[PDB]
Amino acid sequence: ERNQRKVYQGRVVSDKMDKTITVVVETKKNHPIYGKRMKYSKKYKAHDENNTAKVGDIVKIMETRPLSATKRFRLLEVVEEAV
Amino acid sequence: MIQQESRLRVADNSGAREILTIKVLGGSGRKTANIGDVIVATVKQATPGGVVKKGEVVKAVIVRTKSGARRADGSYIKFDENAAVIIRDDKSPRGTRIFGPVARELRENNFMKIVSLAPEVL
Amino acid sequence: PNIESAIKRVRTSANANAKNSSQTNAMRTAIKKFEEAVAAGADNVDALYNEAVKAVDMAATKGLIHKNKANRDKIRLSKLAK
Amino acid sequence: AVKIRLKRMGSKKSPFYRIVVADSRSPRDGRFIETVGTYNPLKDPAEVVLKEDLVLDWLSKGAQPSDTVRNILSKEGVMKKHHEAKNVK
RNA sequence: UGAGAGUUUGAUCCUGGCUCAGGACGAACGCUGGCGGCGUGCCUAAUACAUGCAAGUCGAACGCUUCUUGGAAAGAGGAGUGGCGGACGGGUGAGUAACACGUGGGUAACCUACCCAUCAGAGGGGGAUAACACUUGGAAACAGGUGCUAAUACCGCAUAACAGUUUAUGCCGCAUGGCAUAAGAGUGAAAGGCGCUUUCGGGUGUCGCUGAUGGAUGGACCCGCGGUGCAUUAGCUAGUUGGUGAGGUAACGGCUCACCAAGGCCACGAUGCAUAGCCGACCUGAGAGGGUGAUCGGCCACACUGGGACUGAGACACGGCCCAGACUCCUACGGGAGGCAGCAGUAGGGAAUCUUCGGCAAUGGACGAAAGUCUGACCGAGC
RNA sequence: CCCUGACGGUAUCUAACCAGAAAGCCACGGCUAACUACGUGCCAGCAGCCGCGGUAAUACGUAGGUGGCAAGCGUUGUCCGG
RNA sequence: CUCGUUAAGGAACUCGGCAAAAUGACCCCGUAACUUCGGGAGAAGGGGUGCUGACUUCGGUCAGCCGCAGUGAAUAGGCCC
To answer: What's the superkingdom here (chain D) (predicted)?
Structure first.
């Protein structure tokens, strides 16, 4: 357990499925020919023991192992809730 | 018995599927053909690609009729189909493969190149 | 086949297949014979549990099921009777 | 079946060899694990260079030399050290 | 380490295209040719393939049989049962736009013959079978029947839980959980051969056999990011996306089932169509770039076309099996046989690309205790 | 101590003899280094781009000479540069 | 004259498929060109249907049984270019 997994941050986007939520993690990266920085997004699925967190929340997730055909992450904690 | 405007399947690898009979060669008013008889026919359905193309006038020999043949010892044979093999004017198949089973009367009429390639010879 | 040693492998593996299938069917019927008696609620219910466990264990030493399959099997049966 | 064997590196009739530790299924000049010294069949008293602190570590893990590698590993006194570490403790 | 020139006009300046002066190549062809060294040589039809060779070995696991020197011991042959190897080495780039590959990580979801280390065993029984002998049907390939026989071949009985699982205790981690110690329940193995001492000695060296744990080595799965054209290709999905349980696998998982719900992906380019093995590298350029993936090394995919399993530590198998298909061949007509994209070689396609060679002396590989036997890998020779 | 080379009597070294056996391809109007004769007469032909050829053609075809490279020299195709 | 059946072939009949034969009910799946945007459309082409038992959320689904054949008789579009 001296080896470490990957944790991320994002805002929840969908909460329709039971026990599963889509989290969008956002970052900026540059253009190969020209210089400037564009923003880039990818969606992740994470596991929810009880269908807790809702849209607009700012969450952290962690890498697990295959839990389904698409989901590979679990829900660590909710950092800041939407209202 | 097979007459004018009967339709036969092809038991050959020649590129023809269905054939329509035009004449029953041999005689002057003869009506029907049988197993081992030669015929003039139209190709009605071909295969995409093939030595023989649709619309052609060609010769064929009958094997395998429904109203079959009778043998000297009192026994009979009958098939579920009518079929023919397209022929090259000295009894050789214009293909290289015969399909399905064949009546033993093709020996007496001397289609010996065809009795070599048939899977079963009854 | 062409090579002389390929001709021997054919009969050797045919014979191995014969006895392997025989013994696997033995094991499968022992297990099923326990299941059909626990689904009836019959007397003589622990003895055939024992026999099915022994059947699986012996199949694992004959190189027929791996070893983890045997642990799985014994677990499943244990949760049904004892 | 880890081995310690020779690997040809000459041109056509002037051969040279690297002493290498490889899985035995690999091709003679294909993939290997690491290189351990050098050996030169010309140069009348033949030239051997080798580290001899990795040879003693691979030997104690079950690697095995070929016949020529054993000859040139005993001319260097590496087999005696293996002897004095294993069956002496 | 950044060189330019000719050409629109009666003459001009600007704009602008076209052309030339440098490199390189698996090159082809015209004229012409003395040698050595080191390299390279089907880019096209993943077209069809005569002929030889490319994978065997072990008598120190076991019974038989033929000789050379009626009882004799050795040497040299023959097939058979049994072990191990045949999944490596060697070939090709047709498929593939995706975890296939490159680089960086994870497995508290995993397996591993031979090799090295450690601990513990190695007890006592049984029933067969090939070979062989006789015999039937066979055109053949080959099939059956009767009788005898061996083992490290096969099968049960014993003994072993250090393996898994459950309970209590202590420590700990990133959810699921991990480690160590104690108990309780049902259970599971094994084989000899060759020597030395041989007072019955009953001891022992060595190589093999069984169970458990580590190392090494090889494989498996998941993830971030990166490399192609078309929008005169905008909608795609119904095991589809998630949950509950059950089965299944080395292993997690819609992997597969039954039920419940209505979700998933897309302008940051989904879907479809076309083309393409990917990389280290190679050519060119002042650089940024652009164009290729031949010799050599790594990963992948395929083996006449398409389906399937079996044996095995490992294959859904490159000179293995079964079925279907096209093609070729032998037949007494009842039936049988085959797969050069291994090395040479042939016909064909093309502008175009080599010898039907020698040897295991060297390096590597298989089996064997070893001498050795096998090796078109490979080392050399030829054009 | 003792035992093994396919290449192969190969590379190599020594002695004698002999200038004797061993030079071709492209170009020469401007770009771009290297010119005069004769033949022919918008013909026969040449060209990468400008463009040559109708009686005195350094642009076609030969000869003499000259330039570039050399066991090679030119041509076509493909790619980067300009 | 009015009816029923017919081997093999299947429009070779005749001015002409005339006359016959074939389709025909209900439930489910699917369905082109063209268009006055309503249609075309029952387009075309395919599948189910009896009896017993269990469950039936409800409408049905599973297990079993019998015959050549389950709208087992009578009644009921042939279609396409």
So the answer is: Bacteria
How far, in Å, CA of D83 to CA of D89, rounded? 10
Q: Work out how many domains chain D is built from and give that number.
A: 1
Whole-angstrom distance, CA of residue C63 vs CA of residue B82: 58
Q: List the D34-40 sheet strands across, edge first.
A: D47-49, D34-40, D17-23, D2-8, D64-65
Query: In angstroms, how far is E277 C1' from C80 CA?
Result: 53
C19 CA from E150 C1′ (Å): 22
**H-run or E-run covering B107:** helix B105-108
Q: Fill in the amino acid letter for B83.
A: A
From which experimental method does this structure derive?
Answer: cryo-EM
Q: Roughly what angle, to the nearest 10 degrees, separates helices C46-61 and C68-78?
A: 180
List the subunits that have 3+ CB pairs under 8 angstroms with C: none
Residue found under tokens 């970052």: A27
Half-sphere exposure (Cβ direction) of D23: Cα atoms closer than 13 Å: 5
Domain range enclosing D7: 1-89
Cα-based distances in Å from B67 to A28, B30, B76, B77, B78: 84, 18, 10, 9, 6
Q: Where are the domains of chain B?
A: 1-122
Q: Residues B78, B82, B88, B94: what is their CA dihedral angle, to the nearest 10 degrees?
A: -100
